[PDB]
Chain A
């Protein structure tokens, strides 16, 4: 179990760690989050009390280094930083742990939610979508645009998700125009899986990361990517059986975790109705269809 200490909390802020959140008051003696499960990526995230504009946060994996949070009064945000002195940091954690100035990652033993949401998410792949190679952790916020959004403006602050475009030469083989547009199997299986992602685990990892950025930061381009990656599978007549079964589990836990009150903005009616009711895979997502019908029947 690992720890991210906090130097101080000088401004009032709602702090998230994965699917959990807690409010910290201005100058409250908060000094971090302990008992963080090893083996998964995590995200610590922030929304200031005075300006709910810009949710922002950091993806990290405690196996890769010792990370801590300190407020920068010049840039006006909580920043993640890596400490190389393993003794200086251990002294920081043990001292604050003795003073009980840390919240405990509040995982219920029965509860596999976070594993299920991050099963295929790897820090190494996050660091390629979010390019800042001098750090081992990755900053994301509400406003960051995707490479695809930019083509349609600062490159260094972009989300480099894999570009998916159903009306593109990449997606459509010359001479197979109608075939490839109505059945996206060659674009899914040859172009994307075999060519770009190499395997379904990396594809699902990017789909899962896009969803999490959509949910935790309201990142609109991430929501576009999540839906595009769903649609590309559902619109393919030929998908390996293991991928369809895994997709149903992935989406089930995403829909289960989504705040009920954000479905209006984070769920695209067209994609979901097409995916569950019209597409080739309309009968392959039983768990996802059942939760969607019972939790968001309005959208459908």
Chain B
């Protein structure tokens, strides 16, 4: 059934599973027309498909051409998401296919179930967690590859960098969700925290800076403060 705080450790067991987040698939800017009406312009988007145990990210870039001449784009975006996730599963070797796919938004359940009819043994699950994966486009290297794409493209990343050499999957996912929650609540401050010290760099083959264990503790504390603060600046507390 639904994934929640109670069954959280299941994410890090040895049954292959993927989170799918569709919130950055259909992205637009709203603007005025010469006649003073409102119109939208699509920009490139992406499906965020993540193995929380291993950190493997299947970033399917959604190029604006897929929307050309289509109606009801927000509905279509869910079905396109499900089509691409199904295509990804079929492309994987049997022993790499997931046993479960957890969708971050319940509106993806029926589209994904229908596209996965050929895979009756893959469980499609909602979640009660409010995960911050929308903030994936605040990671500079991910945003850059999405915006530069001139055609549909899949790009593979490890969203944990080399963290699993030193920490467990549980701890890695907790750090990722902390970073993304911070970027989502106050992107400017979060990015300042991550890059304030010019001596800590991002490796070419990494997404995040090369912090030592002690520096990650400082970073993580700075992110918590930011989230609590913003929570105060918001509700005045």
Residues of A within 8 A of B79 (CB): 177-178
Q: Are A167 and B76 in contact (CB under 8 A)?
A: no
Are B110's CB and A177's CB within 8 A?
no
Cβ of B114 within 8 Å of any chain A Cβ, yes or no, is: yes
With contacts A177-B79, A177-B82, A177-B83 taken as known, whether A172 is within 8 angstroms of B111 at the C-beta atoms is: no
CB atoms of B113 and A167 under 8 A apart:
yes
Binary flags per residue of A47-62, CB closer than 8 Å to B gives 1, else 0: 0000000000000000
**B27 interface residue (CB < 8 Å to A):** no
Q: Is B117 located at the chain interface by the 8 A CB criterion?
A: yes
Q: Complex formed: what's the CA distance from A168 to B110 in Å? A: 12
Determine how close the nearest CB of chain B comes to the CB of A152; give it in whole angstroms: 14
Contact B111 A169 (CB under 8 A): no
- Cβ of B111 and Cβ of A178 under 8 Å apart? yes
CA distance A172 to B111 in the complex (A): 12
A-B contact count (CB 8 A): 23
Cβ of A181 within 8 Å of any chain B Cβ, yes or no, is: yes
- Beta-carbon contacts of A142-169 to B below 8 Å, as 1s and 0s? 0000000000000000000000000111
How far does the Cβ of B111 sit from chain A's closest Cβ, in whole Å?
7
Taking a contact as CB atoms under 8 Å apart, the answer to whether B117 and A167 are in contact is: yes
Q: Closest B-chain residue to A170, C-beta based? A: B117
Known: A168-B117, A169-B117. A181 touches B83 (CB 8 A): no
Contacts of B113 in A (CB 8 A): 167
Q: Which residue of chain A is the closest to B80 with respect to CB atoms?
A: A178
B106-149 CB contact bits vs A (8 Å, 1 = yes)? 00001101110110000000000000000000000000000000
CB contact under 8 A between A167 and B83, given known A172-B117, A178-B76: no
CB–CB A167/B110 < 8 A: yes
Contact with A along B65-105 (1 / 0, CB 8 A): 00000000000100100110000000000000000000000
Q: Which residue of A lies closest to B112 (CB)?
A: A177
Interfacial chain A residues near B76, Cβ < 8 Å = 178
Measured CA separation A169–B117 after assembly (Å): 7
Cβ contacts under 8 Å, A169 to chain B: 117-118
Complex Cα gap A172–B118 (Å):
11
Chain B contacts of A168 at CB under 8 A?
Answer: 117
